[model samples]
Target: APWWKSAVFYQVYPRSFKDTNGDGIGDFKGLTEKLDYLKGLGIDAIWINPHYASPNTDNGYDISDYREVMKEYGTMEDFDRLMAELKKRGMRLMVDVVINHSSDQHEWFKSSRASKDNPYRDYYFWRDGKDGHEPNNYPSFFGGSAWEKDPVTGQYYLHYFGRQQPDLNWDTPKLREELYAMLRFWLDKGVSGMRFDTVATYSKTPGFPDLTPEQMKNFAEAYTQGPNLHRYLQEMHEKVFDHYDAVTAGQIFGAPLNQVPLFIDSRRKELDMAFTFDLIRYDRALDRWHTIPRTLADFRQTIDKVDAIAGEYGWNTFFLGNHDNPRAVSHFGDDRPQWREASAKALATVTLTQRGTPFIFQGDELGMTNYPFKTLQDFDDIEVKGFFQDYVETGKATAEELLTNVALTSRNNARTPFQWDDSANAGFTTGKPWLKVNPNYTEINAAREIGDPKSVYSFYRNLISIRHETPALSTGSYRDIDPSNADVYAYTRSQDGETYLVVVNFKAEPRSFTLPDGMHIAETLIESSSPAAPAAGAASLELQPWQSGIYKVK
Candidate 1:
């Protein structure tokens, strides 16, 4: 089996992980100092957010230079040292690749917009006005028109995200070659893999056709997973990926349910795995702003559908939190003081044991909760500010209403600094942090949990240990044991003549379940609460609120 099949990924947001030199921002040096702590957590690899040179208008996603490390992050020497440290520990490093777009401050975009006759003009999508209007009726993913007019050239350029991010034209062969070279540049430096950002939107529809009113609202349908996507990915594989022993995971944005297999199937050779938005999009509306609490059935439907599809044709990338989303424990589990540890462990039992590569976000091991954001001024994300300005100014929503929605769905919820200890700034920095630390850090920092057997950090450590030791937990065939049970989520994993069962109580009430005939609990491998011995061939067991257990079955 491949190494990634059994690997667990820990994602680190560079700007929030730690800060050294009293700079109030995390740098490569800060990350280097924390390698031992990460290795002790039992992760196989670390996936760091983009550290390339950028204006940071979109928090490092908008890249100005792919070859150079961000000045705020560190220099090339610092990155090399970090890589060397990881290599010494027998761990791998996976860096983020933001190739779908480039920052407007980038030299390529600057030359492209300098003049139409410039040699770099074709590097980006540029269009002329039609009847004193913009190119098309497409709206940006953030807000407003996707086209931005350059006053100097009098031509409109395309940007799917923000005005600072200009979408690259993959139709241009020279641009594709440039990107391929950049990828190889990093791979040669001992990086093991890449996490491609917004990779499904690499190709665009030909002719730049105008969208209908409905299609305008669903702009991703027109731009993402375009007609030439397969050809582009295949060419990418032939030019760069086929030569290296690298793992490629694409962010499959707005991809159709049936088309996911085409991008990640091992036979296709496009990507090793891909991230699907089905599970995260369950609570958001079509506009992607409003939020509602999702029920257990919603989660079950999404997971089952993805499992059924990916299990047959491709591999899946499982993750609950990242730089762009809220923290997992705060979103999926009870983050209150009483239930925080148990609920976080239960969530780990369910996701970490599934048939996919599990990704644990930084601070998740300590059961981090969301920040208590009181006003709009507290957020630093461009998306949050853009949405607030667009909706609140246009009467679509009021300030208070939008604030409430942001509290539940802001990306800043995941961008807060990691709480290392109960010191000033959560021991993350000597100076003020770039963003505020969660106020509850005093009760949930790593200092309190690192040595405690009952802490969430210890629970995650045990879970990863089990995943490493049990073949059935890593590469097993999955079967839902009680698909329709509203209170209990149960599944079975079988591999190499061995079987294991995982049960999770998703609610705040006690639930009773009886094992089917011919199934007997051989051993209780791990549990959030004390395990009770099962009675003979068939047994009925009761679970407390937010309880989870893994059992060896006979």
Candidate 2:
């Protein structure tokens, strides 16, 4: 049996998780204090975001070294203790492994940049200027040419992200071997698994090439969808990750639908599962100035596609929000009033009932809303700064307009300090926090949610428990029950002789739907908005606005 199939995963953003040193930054000790709390929540695994040594560029995605933990997170010994605690509690640990690139300050990159002839020079992609300009027509994800020229060496290096984050040359056999060694070192230390960041970008097309005019407008082409990535991933799987029974998930992009099964096929062991950003992209309402629309159908399709494509080959993982996205309550549900609590509970029910491993982001249990920062100056995300610069370069929005937009949608909205209580700084720190705390701390916090039986936090605890108790919810195959119903999201989780029907009302008004004959409502698993009053022999059930429930239907 797959360990994750019956588990709930929690994501922790270390910088803002908790602070123990009173130095403003959250540390390893701070996280340890919350272990019991997490265990109590019924979560089985924790995926800690990058805590490796870095300049904080890209928020630790740019690693300076693969072998060492950042000073802020404590020493290697501390991680050992953290692992021991989780193992004792029957929990697992999944760490973020950033392999796409390393920081410019990394010893390898520093040495390579010092001179063109350095041994480490070939460790990264470097090219001479073409026609007196930077080679290739690639644009960085940070809104600039993918190539950054180093005047000292008169050569340009490829950086799909920020210029300081130089893409590693995966074509080198020696480099791949070194990365595999790094993986073994961590796995040997009892790390349960790893979440690979940008695994598909490890391979790139041969030679410099420009995109068509249509492709030029979209910056994603330059960084992803390379042909050689699968080969590299297969090699890594065969040489490194497969050696351990540890779970490895890839953050893949640009791969076609047919190719997903190949990567996720357990027979090949390329990846245990893969996170496709398709759902997140579909949520982006490009017409609404690129704002995301929290439509129920969009979310359902994302879940359905995973179940359809990879369920048979390997396993699927489900997540609605994460460190990069805004809080679900703010994006999909009302951030205030009873609707917030209802929406949170409903979402949790939907996620847990799905056919994949459920991942809950930090503060999600408390129904955390997006932190409101009055100005751009209050934000600290590097992507926000880059986009602000893009607006300035385009000469469309004025400085004030650009900053205003940044304040509204910056990733900093979710990176704020976790609201533990109504205490000063939300009880996250005795001093200042790395990021500002959300102002709603007084009312929406762990301390409040845990006490209230009907609060979002308590509902999630029950949701997980139900999944563990029910076989259908744990290892059942999923089948979409409704596809065209925009107002309703319904699906069935079925196992041998047992089946469960989960229906959620995503609309703002009351609605009812007819279920197949002989399907009886066994029990009301969870009610988010208000309790549903279903009568025996009743062919239809009505759902209130934002209401959701799981029925043990046979």
Candidate 3:
């Protein structure tokens, strides 16, 4: 197994993590200042969101220069220092790489769109319109048609996301070679690997085929299951990954369940690991713009289905929330005052104890909840804004309805400037912050949590330490304890004669559990503080609201 197999990763969304220059935006220097804090949290690696030079069209996902650091995030020299500090702390770096598209401001798109006869014309998907309209009815992930008509070439260019993000033509060998070179550029700089952004959609359908307007929304089937996706990733492996001590974790959102193994199975050589959006979309009502409620059974069953395949066929990466999601506490766990810390700890128990590498989004360890976004102007996310504007105009959604959903499902929930201390701007910046700090920062900031022994932050530290010390968590076979229990999720990880039982009360009410067959608690491992917990070694347990317990079992 590789180093990543047993390591825990922390995702750092740079613009919201910290700010040292009073520029409102967080930079590499701010992250450098927090290096010790992360090391103390017991994370083995950090996955940073795209920090490349960009026009800020999808927050830096649309890269203008793969090799240059974004000016707002500080200079390349500052990045080097951050990398150096991470190495000193023995933590690895996984950069978020968005090769699915380039910012229209990128030199490649500019040159490629210059004229029909340009040598770089093949670098992107430029096609003649059909009957004076887009070649197909495919809709962008942001909204509307995926094609943006280019004034220079008279041909519509494909953009699977925002118009500013032109999808790169992976079919072009020169374009792929450039990407390979760009990947090696960072690997040579000593990055552990890449957290590939939208890696599954790199290859689009041929012939510019039509999809029904309804299907075009979050159209992962046509976009992800492309003819050349695996081929391109394999080529990437051959050209760049094979030559370095590296790994890969693709954001294979909406990837078909069965097709996932081909992308992540080491034997396939396409990707080292990949995360599917199926789990995160559990609470989404059709799309992220809408919301729905999820039950404990739904959560357990979802993870069980995907995690069961990992040990034998591939690997799993457990991340409850990240840069694109709302806070874990608010999304999957109870975020109310009484249950907030307990639920955060409970979720951490499940995520870190599961047989997979875990990724902790920044602020999750501090039990950060979603910022109460008010008006539409409060949102800084391009995806939500695009949908809010387009959906409202088209009568698909109303202004009030969209705002309510955005408040619940918007990425800004997780993108709020980190609550470092009870200071002006939550100590995220000395100047006005890029995004407003969450109002609860005074109580939920990292400074307050770290000082409290029983805080969610401390619990996360304990969970990581326990996972590192217990090999079963990393290598054991997984088994469910109570498949029919809706109020609680109970499972076990066993290797040889050693087994650990993990059970969590997922709601705000008391939940009781009885051991299956002859299983008994052999020793107490770690558990969230509960007003009522089953006695150590007891076969039956009483779990308080959001209480979670892990124990050595027989």
> Scored by CA lDDT, what does every candidate get?
0.87, 0.80, 0.87
* 261-356 per-residue lDDT for model 1 (tens digits): 888888887998888888877787766778877787778777888877776558887887877777788888888877878888898887689888
Better of 1 and 2 by TM-score: 1
Please list all clashing residue pairs in model 1, or write none if there are none.
Answer: none
Q: Tell how far residue 28 is off in model 1, in angstroms.
A: 0.9
Candidate 1: where are CA atoms >4 Å away? Answer: 531-538
Clashes of 3: 0
Clashing pairs in 2: none
> Judged by lDDT relative to the true structure, which candidate is superior, 1 or 2?
1
RMSD of each: 1.3, 2.0, 1.3
| CA shift of 362, model 1, Å | 0.8
In order of appearance, the predictions have TM-scores of: 0.98, 0.95, 0.98
The per-residue C-alpha lDDT of model 2 at residue 335 equals 72
